[PDB]
Curated annotation (Swiss-Prot):
The chain holds residues 252 to 349 of 376 of the full protein. Essential for the homologous recombination (HR) pathway of DNA repair. Involved in the homologous recombination repair (HRR) pathway of double-stranded DNA breaks arising during DNA replication or induced by DNA-damaging agents. Part of the RAD51 paralog protein complexes BCDX2 and CX3 which act at different stages of the BRCA1-BRCA2-dependent HR pathway. Expressed in a variety of tissues, with highest expression in testis, heart muscle, spleen and prostate. It is linked to Fanconi anemia complementation group O: A disorder affecting all bone marrow elements and resulting in anemia, leukopenia and thrombopenia. It is associated with cardiac, renal and limb malformations, dermal pigmentary changes, and a predisposition to the development of malignancies. At the cellular level it is associated with hypersensitivity to DNA-damaging agents, chromosomal instability (increased chromosome breakage) and defective DNA repair. It is found in: Nucleus; Cytoplasm; Cytoplasm, Perinuclear region; Mitochondrion. Part of the RAD51 paralog protein complexes BCDX2 and CX3; the complexes have a ring-like structure arranged into a flat disc around a central channel. The BCDX2 complex consits of RAD51B, RAD51C, RAD51D and XRCC2; the CX3 complex consists of RAD51C and XRCC3. The BCDX2 subcomplex RAD51B:RAD51C interacts with RAD51. Interacts with SWSAP1; involved in homologous recombination repair. Interacts directly with PALB2 which may serve as a scaffold for a HR complex containing PALB2, BRCA2, RAD51C, RAD51 and XRCC3. Interacts with HELQ. Interacts with DNA damage up-regulated protein DDUP. The lineage of its organism: Eukaryota, Metazoa, Chordata, Craniata, Vertebrata. Belongs to the RecA family. RAD51 subfamily. Induction: Stress-induced increase in the mitochondrial levels is seen. It comes from the Eukaryota. This is DNA repair protein RAD51 homolog 3. It comes from Homo sapiens.
Length: 98
DNA sequence: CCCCCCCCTATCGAATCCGTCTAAAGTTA
């Protein structure tokens, strides 16, 4: 997909349609994104992909990342609660605590 | 003429010596 403007238009239309559908049909919507590397000077940071304008589309945004052998859940953007950090784990039973 | 975005890579390079112990066996008028 070489044309960035076309991708931006498609993503904006998709976000509008998804929020309209979620509000109209009383639905909870979850989307999954991928990280990417942003380089400034000589250090690199992991940021969500798909540009910057995509950040306004999601009502709530969460970020998972590694710290030693621990998994952390961070509430990045939300209009109802405050930023927090949560430790979670993956077990044979599934998504769990600790 | 109009309005918005992308991405990690790759190993290197040796130094520095110390600290002594344990005696035994008589001979030939």
């Amino acid at each position: 997909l070489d044309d960035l403007s076309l991708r931006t238009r498609l993503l904006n239309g998709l976000a509008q349609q998804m929020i309209s559908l979620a509000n109209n049909h009383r639905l909870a919507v979850i989307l999954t994104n991928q990280m990417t590397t942003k380089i400034d000077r000589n250090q690199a940071l992991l940021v969500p992909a798909l540009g910057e304008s995509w950040g306004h589309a999601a009502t709530i945004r969460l970020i998972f990342h590694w710290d030693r052998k621990q998994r952390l859940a961070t509430l990045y953007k939300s209009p109802s609660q405050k930023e927090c950090t949560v430790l979670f784990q993956i077990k044979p039973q599934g998504f769990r605590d600790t």
